[PDB]
Design a protein around this ligand. Structure first.
Ligand code: ADP
Ligand code: CA
Ligand code: CA
Ligand code: CA
Ligand code: CA
Ligand code: MG
Length: 459
């Protein structure tokens, strides 16, 4: 049972970066290279290409495992004699750092919204055995220029896998944001919490909680752990916000709140959607019927790699709200409550609902939509499925998807090409059988652009 995931679509290319992209401007420079706004040479579509001077399979590999509304999207990557190129989604709102140095101080509303999303991203990461290790405003972007824009985590270049059994030793991070245990040399994922706790402090007050004349002075202050709410700007701030801050900056790792639990903090919760949009999205999800693997990959590809941010803004909000526990995966129960929530919005009566019928209704949706069979509906699976099928199955998107599947340009999708798309040596004759039997028209052993077109076009 080959698992369709967005990540499987990012392949190590065997074209030259410059054969497919063109630089526009610099968005930012990093310690070992720069991130460069590029346009795809054929479609003028804009990406942010992170360039890494060899003079890192891992930043790519971690990113293929992540699919989350507040985590940066990786599209593909290239390798050079001298360089790696990581083709990424561009987020046009720039750094949270800039917005911090600009707006100076944040609304409790705006801070909670920002922090909720960061915490959601890392709760998800932590679930997948990944620790970020370098959270700071510089590594958080706003998606676009809108007022209350969505937040994206980036710079997975210091991130790594962790095991609950062993602990990490390497000293990684940034003075203001680094957790004391990282300095000492034995740490776990809770360092990301500490960092987020620092970030939250800054957003609400404008100042770091641990400062000094220079790096060294800061690390001493950090390593002491002592911080204060003694500044005038804190008289304005509610105790619950401070309470969360205290729990996130608890000196001792074991006493410190996890991301997962931080999401449930009173403050984050206490602090919108057109019923039509919700209705359509839930309708579009209910009407998705599972299908053979060629179509599945195609749709997930179209959903996960070929939709723009502008196209998914409604869908992005809906997901985060349907994700009651924030963890970046929709489960049976959350999905159940979405329907119910919609039912309330339509005046239906709760008691007048067959909870077990809905439960069954949702068991089947999950079966249909859970492309990778991990028992959860993740963001890209959601998007693929919830987007209006005429919009999604635009003539462009269709053409572009087939193009990507048909690797050898032959104008026909072969089982070998399908295996390649999945990231597997070949496809079960059984699963390829199950495909043609539903798609092959001429009857020639392969799927061409007309055969493909009709397969999905039956919406
Ligand atoms: N997708 C993106 N969209 C817009 N700006 C970006 C993007 N990715 C990175 N940047 C800018 O480039 C900077 C450096 O990128 P980052 O991945 O943090 O690399 P480094 O590890 O070298 O800091 C970011 O802080 C940000 O300003
Ligand atoms: Ca969830
Ligand atoms: Ca899934
Ligand atoms: Ca082919
Ligand atoms: Ca055929
Ligand atoms: Mg950075």
């Amino acid at each position: 049972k080959l698992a369709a995931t967005p990540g499987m679509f990012v392949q190590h290319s065997t074209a030259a970066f410059s054969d497919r992209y063109k630089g526009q401007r610099v968005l930012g420079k990093g310690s070992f290279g720069e991130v460069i706004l590029c346009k795809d040479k054929v479609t003028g579509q804009e990406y942010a290409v992170k360039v890494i001077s060899k003079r890192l399979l891992k930043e790519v590999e971690l990113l293929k495992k992540l699919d989350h509304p507040n985590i940066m999207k990786l599209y593909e990557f290239f390798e050079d004699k001298g360089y790696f190129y990581l083709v990424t989604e561009v987020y046009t709102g720039g750094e949270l750092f800039d917005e911090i140095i600009s707006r100076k101080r944040f609304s409790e509303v705006d801070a909670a919204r920002i922090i909720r999303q960061v915490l959601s991203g890392i709760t998800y990461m932590h679930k997948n055995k990944i620790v970020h290790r370098d959270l700071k405003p510089e590594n958080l972007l706003l998606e676009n220029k809108r007022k209350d824009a969505n937040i994206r985590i980036i710079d997975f270049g210091l991130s790594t896998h962790f095991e609950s059994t062993k602990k990490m030793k390497d000293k990684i991070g940034t003075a203001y944001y680094i957790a004391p245990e990282v300095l000492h040399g034995t740490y776990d994922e809770k360092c990301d919490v500490w960092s987020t706790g620092v970030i939250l402090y800054i957003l609400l007050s404008g100042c770091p909680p641990f400062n000094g004349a220079n790096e060294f002075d800061i690390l001493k202050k950090v390593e002491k752990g002592k911080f204060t709410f003694d500044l005038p700007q804190w008289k304005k701030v509610s105790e619950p916000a401070k309470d969360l801050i205290r729990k996130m900056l608890a000196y001792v790792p074991t006493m410190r709140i996890s991301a997962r639990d931080a999401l449930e903090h009173e403050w984050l919760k206490t602090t919108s959607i057109d019923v039509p949009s919700l209705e359509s999205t839930i309708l579009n999800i209910r009407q998705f019927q599972g299908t053979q693997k060629l179509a599945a990959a195609a749709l997930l590809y179209m959903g996960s790699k070929l939709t723009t941010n502008e196209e998914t803004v409604e869908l992005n909000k809906i997901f985060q709200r349907m994700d009651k526990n924030g963890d970046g995966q929709l489960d049976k129960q959350e999905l159940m409550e979405g329907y119910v929530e919609l039912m309330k919005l339509k005046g239906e009566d709760v008691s007048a609902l067959d909870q077990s019928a809905i439960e069954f209704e949702v068991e089947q949706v999950l079966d249909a939509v859970d492309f990778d069979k991990n028992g959860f509906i993740e963001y890209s699976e959601f998007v693929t499925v919830a987007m209006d099928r005429k919009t999604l199955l635009s003539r462009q998107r269709l053409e572009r998807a087939f193009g990507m599947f048909d690797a050898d340009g032959s104008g026909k999708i072969s089982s070998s090409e399908l295996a390649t798309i999945f990231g597997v040596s070949e496809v079960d004759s059984e699963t390829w059988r199950r495909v043609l039997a539903e798609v092959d028209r001429n009857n020639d052993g392969e799927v061409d652009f007309e055969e493909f077109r009709q397969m999905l076009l039956k919406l």
